[PDB]
């Protein structure tokens, strides 16, 4: 489920379920029915692997920490010689050691992965 | 390996089959329980072309599966072998249909004719459905080894020879595999060796693993020391552990 | 002296340099992965490797540099005390700390000192000394050490113990192992778990690495050193080794006996060749021969120009008898007879080596005052060689 | 479908020779040849036309009385039976042990296919005097003693065991033990009480020879 | 970080308060041994006090 | 994180190894303080009560944290971080009491409890007449504590007010920094490498030989030095 459905009337969510005479897929609540067509094929996603391009939370005040160290990257969209890059925060051996730069005058975050 | 095929890559890599290549979790990224009452018809424009091609039977609930480029070389690009795995694992009223490495999107559909009953099957086919190879193996690494083969003029030569190293202990499986030698198969874990093998076998096992423990201090023990050991330990038809569960249960003298 | 600092520093950049370059390429992606690892694991072990490697080879310059009137290198030669790590360590350059087998690790949020920076992969960030212990040490670098040393009295403290505790249990366990006047070693009630002591029945005091020549060599070298025919030409005796020159030439006793004993050779060499698959030859064996033969040597003093005065029926013969005179079992039955016959098989074989025909008629050049001598001490030897019983 | 049939006659195939070489070590009569046969005149010896495995592979020994009957002159004939059906129930063995007392042989070897019931294993032990022996195809696939870690194992008979005894002055408790579920004890056929002789290398000397009594 | 060093602060302050919960539970008994006469707290603490004394010693 | 709060190579050997431990040189431990001025004074610079705060229509908020426990969330944390330690600089803040700002998780904690090891540090700010972060203790700060310690000896008038470490405690150039502190911070090891970023970079110059060789200067955002 990418996205949970949550009843319009209180506030819980909606199961899933079929209404059969009519062969499509409909939602429903427990507390008050909030019958509706359910338009929607998602039921449910796994995901297996990390998402590509994971970053971080990328607040406006990353370029205040002291410790991120600064490189000369070009930046690709604003053509600035400054930038603070650092590595994948997956926390596992499977990521790879790729660095993320952000550059502090456009907010603009680009990869070193070349390839 | 086996003598003839000795330095042998091709032969190696081939018989390196063996590793539990676990179920589609190892080379899936995802899944899905798209919803679609319509048997001939599906929502996703991609898949169909494959339904095209196809086309108590009508399965409202449709599961996808979506593999990567892994499966080129840790599969082999196996496209059509792990859909008759499944379908051999499941059979039943499994509909599942698989694209033959056509398409740059490859699709695994899956149906099931009689939301809940999706989940715990996609469960079930996520962790114990084994596609290929022998279980408790994780790991199988090719090392090039050198042998001191006697030549044929007399002389004795080093004749570099595959060799297979495993992070499992499945021996029992791994000697009925094809294509190896049974007859120098070795395992670091002497537990195991006598349930296959007999006890002298075990006794062997047990002494060799102690010469090799006693190998890197540089430090030179003679052979009678640790073969009085090792015979003490397997004096009876079992191992028999030095600690108070092992040699203590004997009828020797309650006081010693 | 200057020019061997300046080459230690070059090495040591040129790895710095090597392992930036590896730290670049892996950063881009552009690092294939080996089999059965990750792309951390395999870049650690590249990092590790390079910084190993780099120390080394700056020990080795530093090594080589020192004179022969250097007191440390001097020490070294003889052995009493010092090893080339130390040369190494107090001259050229520390090797890279490891903790738990691995470089030091990340004690802060992904970084190691406050004094670097985050996300620092350098060798230098990640414990590594480029300095000496002369030179001195940067506080990084010395806390890195005492992090090392912390770490390797602790793995002592722990270690004495458990080896300790397992030392109590196994002689807990085999306390009361006895080897008996029958020559088999039982435990206090009695239950046999060795029909003779070792195997072979032979004291561990009185065993001495020797070389096994049959095992090894080819089979044309092989026929060279043993095969003797006193028909053919091929492998024909030379009549100046021995008194009895053209006159043993035709006989047909000395043949057959000849050729009985390369067939015994040869079956030895077959059979140890199935006992030894890897043709290993240096294996530990109760007596030496080969100092009884140069004592024998160097007493009776050989002229080794005069012709020998041994036959070829003596030298079977004694040979023969030696080997019947072997006892380490001394019994009437046939079980017993059998036990005995194939706990002395190698030394047998050995025997069968060393004084073959050829050998020494050729080699070791005796007198028969001084063959039998060999033969004496061979048995005394043997004889007193055997594990007295009743030892623990 | 021919990968599964081909590794089915492949595995039947290692079985059968296994089966073979065990009685030969066991004593009884067996060819060399019949040891060693080729696959191709086995799958036109066996199985079917369509390429199925067939069961229907038995074969009786003769027990040679040149060394096998002089040593153990109590030595019967031994029958080996494959079983055709998957799971091995309790009415198949009933079948199998009525025709091993209707054709009273001394030694009945099953070999089930995957699995075998409690009840059945029950069944198996109320045939006197007669012995009847259940092995696993899975582990007859491999020889267990042609491994290098496998020394020679020697049935002792009755008088050669006094011997031994009376030699060496010991009881019967005073000797090295072997469980009877050991797999060389499985492959030998070892009674209880029985002495059997373990040759092996040494790297001190040539030869060495131990004894190990069955329990 | 995330440990602390317990110096004679928060020790002696965990001692004096199991002793002072002590002598609440005394001087608690003695008062209601005395409601039936007269209440003199002067000898009521002299147990208080050796206690105090003693557990600290 | 014992790095100048222990001393390594010091404890005992044998059973008790790495258990007992040794207070470094220049450490100190927290007595403990009350959090209740440190709650006023955030609440009075606008802080969102945790009541009424709803994590929707709010993403960029920063959680707040006092002594273990969450009060509320805010907004702008930058310019509460910089007055907390304008405050914690001025003395009106109890030097002892250690606040922490995590950039990439939104939360700041806040410390006053006990039991805590600190060390003094140098405070590098930066200058604009020199073009450069400098260290903010001068030769003038030097020469006032050299004469107040040469004053006692021989007594003398009132002189500098016996200008001590409280007064350098108290005009911000020394300020005391716990291990939960130091994962926010960059530290020179030397006052040698606060010197101009670039330091005639691409310039050969010749260096002994038998010293030591250094790689530091790396860096251009230190925020404080070691004292030694
Ligand atoms: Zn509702
Ligand atoms: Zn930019």
Same mark, same amino acid.
């Given at each position: 489920?990418?996205?949970?459905?949550?009843?319009r009337?209180?506030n819980?969510?909606?199961?899933?379920?079929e209404?059969?005479?009519?062969?499509?897929?409909?939602?429903?609540?427990?507390?008050?029915?909030?019958?509706?067509?359910?338009?929607s094929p998602?039921?449910?996603?796994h995901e297996l692997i990390?998402?590509?391009?994971?970053?971080a939370?990328?607040?406006?005040?990353?370029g205040?920490?002291?410790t991120l160290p600064?490189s000369?990257?070009?930046?690709?969209?604003?053509?600035?010689?400054?930038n603070?890059?650092?590595?994948?925060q997956?926390?596992r051996?499977?990521?790879s050691?790729?660095?993320?730069?952000?550059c502090?005058?456009?907010?603009?975050?680009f990869?070193?992965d070349?390839? | 390996? +086996?003598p003839?095929?000795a330095?042998?890559?091709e032969?190696?890599?081939?018989?390196?089959?063996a *590793? &539990?290549? /676990?179920? =589609?979790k190892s080379?899936?990224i995802?899944?899905e329980?798209?919803?679609?009452?319509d048997?001939r018809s599906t929502?996703i424009?991609?898949?169909?072309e494959?339904?095209?091609?196809?086309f108590?039977?009508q399965?409202?609930?449709?599961?996808?599966?979506?593999?990567d480029?892994?499966?080129?070389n840790?599969?082999?690009?196996?496209?059509?072998?792990?859909?008759?795995?499944?379908?051999?694992?499941?059979?039943n009223?499994?509909?599942?249909?698989?694209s033959e490495?056509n398409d +740059?999107?490859?699709?695994?559909?899956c149906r099931v004719?009689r939301?809940?009953?999706?989940?715990? *099957? &996609?469960? /079930?086919? =996520?962790?114990?459905?084994?596609?290929?190879?022998?279980?408790n193996?994780?790991?199988?690494?090719?090392?090039?080894?050198?042998?001191?083969?006697?030549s044929?003029?007399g002389?004795y030569?080093?004749?570099?020879?595959?060799?297979?190293?495993?992070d499992?202990?499945?021996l029992s499986?791994?000697?009925?595999?094809?294509?190896?030698?049974?007859?120098?198969?070795?395992?670091?874990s002497?537990?195991?060796?006598?349930?296959?093998?007999?006890?002298?076998?075990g006794?062997?096992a047990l002494?060799?693993?102690?010469?090799?423990?006693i190998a890197?201090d540089?430090?030179?023990?003679?052979?009678?020391?640790?073969? =009085?050991?090792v015979?003490?330990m397997?004096?009876?038809?079992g191992?028999?552990?030095?600690?108070?569960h092992?040699?203590?249960?004997?009828?020797t003298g309650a006081?010693? | 002296?200057?020019?061997?600092?300046?080459?230690i520093?070059?090495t040591?950049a040129?790895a710095?340099?090597?392992?930036?370059?590896?730290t670049?390429?892996?950063?881009?992606?552009?690092?294939?992965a080996?089999?059965g690892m990750?792309?951390?694991?395999?870049?650690?072990?590249?990092?590790?490797?390079?910084?190993n490697?780099?120390?080394?080879?700056?020990?080795?310059?530093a090594?080589v540099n020192?004179?022969?009137?250097?007191?440390?290198?001097?020490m070294?030669?003889?052995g009493?005390?010092?090893?080339?790590?130390?040369?190494a360590?107090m001259?050229?350059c520390?090797?890279?700390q490891?903790?738990?087998?691995?470089?030091?690790?990340?004690?802060?949020?992904?970084?190691?000192?406050?004094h670097f920076?985050?996300?620092?992969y350098?060798?230098?960030?990640?414990?590594f000394?480029?300095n000496?212990?002369?030179?001195?040490?940067?506080?990084?670098?010395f806390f890195?050490?005492?992090?090392?040393?912390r770490?390797?009295?602790?793995?002592?403290?722990?270690?004495?113990?458990?080896?300790?505790?397992?030392?109590?249990?196994?002689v807990?366990?085999?306390?009361?192992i006895?080897?008996?006047?029958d020559?088999t070693?039982?435990?206090?009630?009695?239950?046999v778990?060795?029909?003779?002591?070792?195997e072979?029945?032979?004291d561990?005091?009185?065993?001495?690495?020797?070389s096994?020549?049959?095992?090894?060599?080819?089979?044309?070298?092989?026929?060279?050193?043993?095969?003797?025919?006193?028909?053919?030409?091929?492998?024909t005796?030379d009549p100046s080794?021995?008194?009895?020159?053209?006159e043993?030439?035709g006989?047909?006793?000395?043949?057959?006996?000849?050729?009985?004993?390369?067939?015994q050779?040869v079956?030895?060499?077959?059979?140890?060749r199935?006992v030894f698959?890897?043709?290993?030859?240096?294996?530990?064996?109760?007596?030496?021969?080969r100092?009884?033969?140069?004592?024998?040597?160097?007493?009776?003093?050989?002229?080794?120009?005069?012709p020998s005065?041994?036959?070829i029926?003596?030298?079977?013969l004694?040979?023969?008898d030696?080997?019947?005179?072997?006892?380490v079992?001394?019994?009437?039955?046939?079980?017993?007879?059998?036990?005995?016959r194939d706990?002395?098989?190698?030394?047998?074989?050995?025997?069968r080596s060393?004084?073959?025909?050829?050998?020494?008629?050729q080699?070791?050049?005796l007198?028969?005052?001084?063959?039998?001598?060999?033969?004496?001490?061979?048995?005394?030897?043997?004889?007193?060689?055997?594990?007295?019983?009743?030892?623990? | 479908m021919?990968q599964?049939?081909?590794?089915n006659?492949?595995?039947l195939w290692?079985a059968?020779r296994?089966?073979?070489?065990?009685?030969k070590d066991?004593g009884?009569?067996?060819?060399?040849?019949?040891?060693?046969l080729?696959?191709?005149?086995?799958?036109?010896?066996?199985?079917?036309?369509?390429?199925?495995?067939?069961?229907?592979?038995?074969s009786?020994?003769?027990?040679?009385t040149?060394?096998?009957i002089?040593?153990?002159?109590?030595?019967?004939?031994?029958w080996v039976?494959?079983?055709d059906?998957?799971?091995?129930?309790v009415?198949?063995?009933?079948?199998?042990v009525?025709?091993?007392?209707?054709?009273?042989?001394?030694?009945?070897?099953?070999?089930?296919?995957?699995?075998i019931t409690?009840?059945?294993?029950?069944?198996?032990?109320?045939?006197?005097?007669?012995?009847?022996?259940?092995?696993?195809?899975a582990?007859?696939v491999?020889?267990?003693?042609?491994?290098?870690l496998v020394?020679?194992?020697?049935?002792?008979?009755?008088?050669?065991?006094?011997?031994?005894?009376?030699?060496y002055?010991?009881?019967e408790?005073?000797?090295p033990?072997?469980?009877r579920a050991?797999?060389?004890?499985?492959?030998?056929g070892?009674?209880?009480?029985?002495?059997v002789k373990?040759?092996?290398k040494?790297?001190?000397?040539?030869?060495?020879?131990?004894?190990?009594?069955?329990? | 970080?995330?440990?602390?060093?317990?110096?004679?602060?928060?020790?002696?302050?965990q001692?004096?308060?199991?002793?002072?919960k002590?002598?609440t539970?005394?001087?608690?008994?003695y008062?209601?041994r005395?409601?039936e006469?007269?209440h003199d707290?002067?000898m009521?603490?002299?147990?208080?006090?050796?206690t105090?004394?003693?557990?600290?010693? | 994180?014992?790095?100048?709060?222990?001393?390594?190579?010091?404890?005992?050997?044998?059973?008790?190894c790495?258990?007992?431990?040794?207070?470094?040189?220049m450490?100190?431990?927290?007595?403990g303080?009350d959090?209740?001025?440190?709650?006023?004074?955030?609440?009075?610079?606008?802080?969102?009560?945790?009541?009424?705060?709803?994590?929707?229509?709010?993403?960029?908020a920063?959680?707040?944290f006092?002594?273990?426990?969450?009060?509320?969330?805010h907004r702008?944390?930058?310019?509460?971080?910089?007055?907390?330690?304008?405050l914690?600089?001025?003395?009106d803040?109890?030097?002892?009491?250690?606040?922490?700002?995590?950039?990439r998780?939104?939360?700041?904690?806040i410390?006053?409890?006990?039991?805590?090891?600190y060390?003094?540090?140098?405070?590098?700010?930066?200058?604009e007449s020199?073009?450069?972060?400098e260290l903010?203790?001068?030769?003038?700060?030097?020469?006032?504590?050299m004469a107040?310690?040469?004053?006692?000896?021989?007594?003398?008038?009132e002189?500098?007010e016996?200008?001590?470490?409280?007064?350098l405690?108290?005009?911000?150039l020394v300020?005391?920094?716990?291990?939960?502190?130091?994962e926010?911070?960059?530290?020179?090891?030397?006052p040698?490498?606060?010197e101009?970023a670039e330091?005639n970079?691409?310039?050969?110059?010749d260096?002994?030989?038998?010293?030591?060789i250094?790689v530091s200067?790396?860096?251009?955002?230190?925020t404080?030095?070691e004292?030694?």
């Amino acid at each position: 489920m990418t996205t949970f459905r949550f009843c319009r009337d209180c506030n819980n969510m909606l199961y899933p379920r079929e209404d059969k005479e009519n062969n499509r897929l409909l939602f429903e609540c427990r507390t008050c029915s909030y019958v509706e067509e359910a338009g929607s094929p998602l039921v449910y996603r796994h995901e297996l692997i990390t998402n590509i391009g994971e970053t971080a939370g990328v607040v406006q005040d990353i370029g205040s920490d002291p410790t991120l160290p600064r490189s000369d990257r070009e930046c690709p969209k604003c053509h600035s010689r400054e930038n603070v890059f650092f590595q994948s925060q997956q926390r596992r051996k499977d990521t790879s050691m790729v660095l993320f730069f952000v550059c502090l005058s456009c907010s603009h975050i680009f990869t070193s992965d070349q390839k | 390996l +086996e003598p003839g095929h000795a330095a042998d890559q091709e032969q190696a890599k081939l018989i390196r089959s063996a *590793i &539990e290549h /676990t179920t =589609l979790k190892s080379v899936t990224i995802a899944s899905e329980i798209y919803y679609d009452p319509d048997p001939r018809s599906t929502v996703i424009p991609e898949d169909e072309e494959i339904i095209q091609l196809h086309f108590d039977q009508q399965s409202p609930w449709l599961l996808r599966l979506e593999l990567d480029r892994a499966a080129m070389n840790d599969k082999d690009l196996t496209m059509g072998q792990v859909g008759e795995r499944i379908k051999q694992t499941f059979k039943n009223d499994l509909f599942v249909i698989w694209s033959e490495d056509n398409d +740059e999107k490859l699709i695994i559909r899956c149906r099931v004719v009689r939301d809940h009953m999706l989940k715990k *099957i &996609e469960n /079930t086919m =996520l962790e114990n459905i084994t596609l290929r190879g022998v279980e408790n193996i994780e790991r199988v690494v090719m090392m090039k080894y050198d042998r001191k083969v006697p030549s044929p003029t007399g002389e004795y030569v080093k004749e570099p020879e595959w060799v297979l190293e495993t992070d499992g202990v499945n021996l029992s499986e791994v000697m009925t595999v094809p294509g190896i030698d049974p007859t120098r198969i070795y395992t670091n874990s002497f537990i195991d060796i006598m349930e296959v093998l007999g006890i002298e076998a075990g006794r062997a096992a047990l002494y060799k693993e102690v010469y090799n423990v006693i190998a890197s201090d540089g430090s030179y023990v003679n052979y009678r020391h640790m073969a =009085l050991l090792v015979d003490v330990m397997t004096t009876q038809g079992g191992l028999t552990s030095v600690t108070r569960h092992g040699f203590n249960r004997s009828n020797t003298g309650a006081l010693m | 002296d200057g020019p061997t600092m300046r080459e230690i520093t070059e090495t040591i950049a040129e790895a710095k340099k090597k392992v930036l370059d590896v730290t670049k390429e892996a950063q881009a992606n552009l690092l294939t992965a080996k089999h059965g690892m990750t792309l951390r694991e395999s870049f650690e072990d590249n990092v590790v490797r390079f910084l190993n490697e780099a120390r080394d080879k700056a020990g080795r310059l530093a090594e080589v540099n020192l004179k022969d009137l250097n007191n440390v290198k001097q020490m070294v030669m003889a052995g009493s005390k010092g090893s080339f790590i130390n040369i190494a360590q107090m001259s050229a350059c520390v090797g890279q700390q490891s903790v738990e087998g691995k470089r030091i690790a990340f004690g802060f949020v992904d970084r190691t000192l406050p004094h670097f920076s985050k996300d620092d992969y350098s060798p230098e960030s990640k414990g590594f000394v480029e300095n000496s212990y002369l030179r001195g040490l940067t506080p990084q670098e010395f806390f890195f050490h005492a992090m090392g040393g912390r770490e390797g009295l602790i793995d002592t403290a722990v270690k004495t113990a458990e080896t300790g505790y397992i030392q109590r249990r196994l002689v807990k366990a085999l306390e009361d192992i006895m080897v008996h006047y029958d020559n088999t070693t039982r435990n206090s009630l009695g239950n046999v778990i060795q029909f003779i002591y070792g195997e072979d029945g032979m004291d561990a005091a009185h065993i001495e690495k020797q070389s096994l020549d049959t095992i090894g060599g080819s089979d044309a070298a092989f026929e060279k050193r043993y095969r003797v025919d006193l028909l053919n030409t091929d492998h024909t005796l030379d009549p100046s080794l021995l008194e009895s020159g053209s006159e043993i030439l035709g006989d047909l006793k000395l043949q057959v006996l000849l050729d009985e004993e390369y067939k015994q050779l040869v079956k030895d060499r077959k059979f140890l060749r199935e006992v030894f698959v890897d043709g290993e030859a240096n294996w530990p064996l109760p007596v030496n021969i080969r100092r009884i033969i140069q004592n024998a040597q160097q007493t009776f003093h050989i002229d080794h120009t005069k012709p020998s005065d041994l036959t070829i029926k003596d030298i079977v013969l004694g040979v023969k008898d030696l080997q019947e005179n072997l006892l380490v079992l001394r019994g009437k039955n046939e079980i017993i007879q059998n036990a005995q016959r194939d706990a002395v098989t190698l030394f047998c074989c050995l025997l069968r080596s060393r004084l073959a025909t050829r050998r020494v008629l050729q080699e070791y050049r005796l007198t028969k005052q001084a063959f039998d001598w060999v033969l004496s001490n061979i048995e005394a030897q043997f004889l007193r060689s055997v594990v007295h019983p009743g030892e623990m | 479908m021919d990968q599964e049939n081909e590794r089915n006659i492949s595995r039947l195939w290692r079985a059968f020779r296994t089966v073979k070489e065990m009685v030969k070590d066991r004593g009884y009569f067996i060819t060399q040849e019949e040891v060693e046969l080729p696959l191709e005149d086995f799958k036109a010896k066996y199985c079917d036309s369509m390429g199925r495995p067939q069961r229907k592979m038995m074969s009786f020994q003769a027990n040679p009385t040149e060394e096998s009957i002089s040593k153990f002159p109590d030595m019967g004939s031994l029958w080996v039976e494959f079983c055709d059906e998957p799971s091995v129930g309790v009415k198949t063995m009933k079948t199998f042990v009525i025709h091993i007392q209707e054709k009273n042989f001394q030694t009945g070897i099953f070999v089930y296919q995957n699995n075998i019931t409690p009840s059945a294993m029950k069944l198996v032990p109320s045939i006197p005097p007669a012995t009847i022996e259940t092995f696993n195809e899975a582990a007859l696939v491999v020889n267990i003693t042609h491994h290098e870690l496998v020394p020679k194992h020697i049935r002792l008979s009755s008088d050669e065991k006094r011997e031994l005894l009376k030699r060496y002055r010991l009881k019967e408790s005073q000797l090295p033990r072997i469980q009877r579920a050991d797999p060389v004890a499985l492959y030998l056929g070892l009674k209880r009480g029985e002495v059997v002789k373990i040759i092996r290398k040494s790297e001190t000397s040539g030869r060495y020879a131990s004894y190990r009594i069955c329990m | 970080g995330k440990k602390r060093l317990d110096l004679a602060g928060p020790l002696l302050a965990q001692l004096f308060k199991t002793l002072f919960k002590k002598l609440t539970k005394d001087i608690f008994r003695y008062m209601q041994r005395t409601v039936e006469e007269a209440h003199d707290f002067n000898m009521k603490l002299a147990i208080n006090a050796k206690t105090i004394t003693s557990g600290l010693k | 994180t014992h790095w100048g709060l222990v001393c390594p190579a010091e404890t005992p050997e044998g059973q008790a190894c790495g258990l007992v431990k040794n207070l470094s040189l220049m450490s100190c431990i927290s007595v403990g303080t009350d959090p209740m001025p440190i709650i006023t004074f955030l609440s009075e610079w606008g802080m969102e009560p945790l009541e009424d705060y709803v994590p929707h229509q709010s993403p960029d908020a920063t959680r707040v944290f006092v002594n273990g426990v969450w009060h509320g969330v805010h907004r702008n944390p930058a310019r509460l971080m910089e007055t907390l330690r304008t405050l914690r600089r001025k003395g009106d803040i109890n030097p002892e009491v250690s606040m922490i700002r995590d950039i990439r998780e939104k939360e700041l904690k806040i410390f006053t409890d006990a039991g805590r090891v600190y060390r003094p540090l140098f405070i590098v700010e930066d200058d604009e007449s020199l073009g450069h972060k400098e260290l903010k203790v001068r030769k003038g700060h030097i020469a006032k504590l050299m004469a107040t310690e040469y004053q006692d000896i021989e007594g003398g008038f009132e002189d500098v007010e016996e200008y001590t470490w409280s007064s350098l405690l108290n005009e911000g150039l020394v300020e005391y920094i716990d291990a939960e502190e130091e994962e926010s911070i960059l530290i020179a090891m030397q006052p040698e490498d606060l010197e101009p970023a670039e330091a005639n970079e691409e310039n050969d110059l010749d260096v002994d030989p038998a010293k030591r060789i250094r790689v530091s200067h790396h860096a251009t955002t230190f925020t404080h030095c070691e004292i030694h």
